[PDB]
Amino acid sequence: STGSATTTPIDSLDDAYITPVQIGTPAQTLNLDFDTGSSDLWVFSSETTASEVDGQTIYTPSKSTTAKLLSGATWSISYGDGSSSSGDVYTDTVSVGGLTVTGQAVESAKKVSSSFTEDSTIDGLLGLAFSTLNTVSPTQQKTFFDNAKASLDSPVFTADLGYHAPGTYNFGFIDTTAYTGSITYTAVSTKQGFWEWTSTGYAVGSGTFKSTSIDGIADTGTTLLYLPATVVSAYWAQVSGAKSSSSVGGYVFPCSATLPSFTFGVGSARIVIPGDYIDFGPISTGSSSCFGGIQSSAGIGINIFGDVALKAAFVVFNGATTPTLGFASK
């Protein structure tokens, strides 16, 4: 089997992407944030604290004939940005772009932090990291991808994120028309539960390529590109007036700038992020100071190839016995 779903930016900055997901019988369609950096599928629901819901579409398990309470199971998760959610667990039928899993753990939020409440366009998350990170207790649950794998034509999913435009998540097949040139595959470590790999270096604008190993994760659930302070300083030094601002929380630059591109290595291949992708607009409405899309990972504890990097590529998440990552230009 296969699945194919369109994923859409939630706003004009591509702060995140939502993909329609059918849950239960009859289908309840919720727009979820597909997150290759976590492994819980959780949703706003009929059980969510009423004051913490503001515009989201909710899953109501009592209206689904295939929903079953997973007796005794709870979940609680915290993300790298400090947001969080928690609740109990149902199993139900979950379909993505024509691909159906029965008995999927659907984690029902009783509590969500303010940033989720304030995000009216995101009805939940669908984790696509490795199932070892799943927070369900006392019995850990599998991701949608892990549940689907055996039925898939090929044990893969692909992320094809758009820049200010819709894109595509495919399950079980590689759309050879969706990218240019070849796909370069690179090794993955699952030791921390992430799609963790090692980039072979970088370049800034038309600069020469610096060969250097950069360990990081492919994370569709993170907006920006977080890299070592040395790399990030080298990038922003090429933008007149750019500076790191503690008060804002990162590198800012004059909105009048033209940003250079940023290239990262995948083995011998190169992915080029256009400078435009790195502009996240005014720090506050009306400001002439703009927020940078490449930021320091120092104090995160890990480098993150978030959407800024991934949307510049066609990305293959290969979940074979030995997982790997593939990157192609597009």
Residue 140 belongs to domain with CATH number: 2.40.70.10
Q: List active site positions.
A: 35, 199
How was this entry determined? X-ray
The verdict on 128 and 237 lying in the same domain is no
Query: CA separation (Å) from 154 to 175, 177, 183?
Result: 12, 17, 16
The verdict on 307 and 294 lying in the same domain is yes
> Which of 151, 174, 197 is at the close of a domain?
174
CA atoms within 13 A on the CB side of 184: 18
Cα distance between residue 228 and residue 275, in whole Å: 19
168-200 core/surface letters (b: 16 or more CB in 10 A; e: else)? bbbbbbbeeeebeeebbbbebeeeebbbbbbbb
Burial of 308 (0-12, 13-18, 19+ CB in 10 A): buried
The verdict on 190 and 243 lying in the same domain is yes
Query: CA separation (Å) from 181 to 143, 197, 271?
Result: 31, 21, 12
Lateral strand order in the sheet of 269-273: 269-273, 262-266, 196-204, 210-218, 303-305, 225-227, 294-296
Domain residues for the domain of 194 are 175-330
Query: CA separation (Å) from 101 to 33, 202, 273, 316?
Result: 18, 40, 35, 21
> Which of 174, 204, 236 is at the close of a domain?
174
Cα distance between residue 167 and residue 161, in whole Å: 5
Q: Over the Cα atoms of the chain, what is R_g? A: 20
The verdict on 196 and 305 lying in the same domain is yes
The verdict on 196 and 231 lying in the same domain is yes
The verdict on 74 and 129 lying in the same domain is yes
The verdict on 286 and 238 lying in the same domain is yes
> Which of 143, 159, 174 is at the close of a domain?
174
The verdict on 162 and 39 lying in the same domain is yes
The verdict on 302 and 325 lying in the same domain is yes
User: Where on the phi/psi map is residue 72: left (φ > 0), alpha (ψ -120 to 50), or beta?
Assistant: left
69-101 core/surface letters (b: 16 or more CB in 10 A; e: else)? ebeebebebebeeebebbbbbbbbbbbbbebeb
Q: Which residue has the tokens 């369900």?
A: 136
Burial of 327 (0-12, 13-18, 19+ CB in 10 A): buried
Q: How many angstroms from the chain centroid is the CA of residue 176? A: 22
The verdict on 209 and 89 lying in the same domain is no
Bridge partners of residue 163, in order along the sequence: none
3-class SS at 277? helix
The verdict on 253 and 142 lying in the same domain is no
Contact (Cβ atoms closer than 8 angstroms) between residue 74 and residue 109: no
Number of structural domains found in the chain: 2
The verdict on 43 and 85 lying in the same domain is yes
Range list of H helices, the chain: 114-117, 144-148, 229-236, 307-310
